[PDB]
Amino acid sequence: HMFDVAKYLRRIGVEGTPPPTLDTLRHLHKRHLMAVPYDNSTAPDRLPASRHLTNVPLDLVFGHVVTEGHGGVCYELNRLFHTLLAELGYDVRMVAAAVRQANGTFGPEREHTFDLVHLDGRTHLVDVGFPGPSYSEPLYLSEEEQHQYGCSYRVTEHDGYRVVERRPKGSDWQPVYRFRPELADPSGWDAVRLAGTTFRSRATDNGKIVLIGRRYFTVEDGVERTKVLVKADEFQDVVDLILAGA
Numbered sequence: 001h002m003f004d005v006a007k008y009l010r011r012i013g014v015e016g017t018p019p020p021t022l023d024t025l026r027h028l029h030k031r032h033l034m035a036v037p038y039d040n041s042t043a044p045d046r047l048p049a050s051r052h053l054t055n056v057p058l059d060l061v062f063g064h065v066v067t068e069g070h071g072g073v074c075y076e077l078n079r080l081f082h083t084l085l086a087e088l089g090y091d092v093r094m095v096a097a098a099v100r101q102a103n104g105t106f107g108p109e110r111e112h113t114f115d116l117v118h119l120d121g122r123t124h125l126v127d128v129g130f131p132g133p134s135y136s137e138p139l140y141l142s143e144e145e146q147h148q149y150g151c152s153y154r155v156t157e158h159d160g161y162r163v164v165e166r167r168p169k170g171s172d173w174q175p176v177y178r179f180r181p182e183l184a185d186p187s188g189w190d191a192v193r194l195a196g197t198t199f200r201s202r203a204t205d206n207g208k209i210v211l212i213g214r215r216y217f218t219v220e221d222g223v224e225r226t227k228v229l230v231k232a233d234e235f236q237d238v239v240d241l242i243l244a245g246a
């Protein structure tokens with residue numbers, strides 16, 4: 001009952017109640033990624049003994065992310081964004097994906113939760129809850145190459161999965177994650193079931209900043225730079241920059 005569109009829109013820097021169009025969807029997606037960081041720092045504290053996502057009141061997540069200004073993880077940020085999009089009139093469908101790992105394999109099949117929107121006869125991928133380098137504006141569900149902020153994307157088909165692939169400047173195509181599109185479900189959120197490595201990131205105007213442990217990544221107009229952070233003060237400055245939003 002505490003979910004509130006206007007409060008959410010203010011939190012992400014969006015004016016008014018913009019119309020249910022593709023241009024609005026693109027703006028909402030980018031603004032959300034710029035304003036609401038991915039952060040798994042306190043994710044365990046919000047988990048339910050039940051292991052069923054429905055036993056995590058949406059108002060709890062809303063209060064943490066929107067009211068209090070914090071970040072969250074894929075089943076928090078995309079769960080909230082699905083609700084926002086539905087209340088703004090979009091036909092939103094929840095989907096889950098398996099994430100490409102560093103070793104080239106894909107992880108558990110439904111680890112990463114995100115959404116699709118079907119609008120005006122076309123389907124778009126929507127994901128404001130992914131820690132690593134990925135798309136700041138929605139992708140079309142198509143193998144046709146798409147270009148945004150200096151990077152290229154495509155959504156290919158392999159062995160019954162659609163695979164999101166990304167290519168920054170100067171590098172090869174690499175998969176991001178894979179999913180079965182036919183399992184999309186308007187009601188799919190209802191069915192979801194030393195400190196650990198911390199993942200924190202947010203979009204910028206022309207790219208993304210990502211901190212995985214000490215591994216700091218930036219992409220700016222498609223040009224990537226990375227650095228393993230040593231100094232505690234520099235590390236804290238990067239954390240602050242990510243969590244402050246934009």
Ligand SMILES: Nc1cccc(O)c1
Binds near residue numbers: 099111112130131132
């Ligand atoms: N939780 C999560 C979701 C997607 C990718 C990833 O590295 C972690």
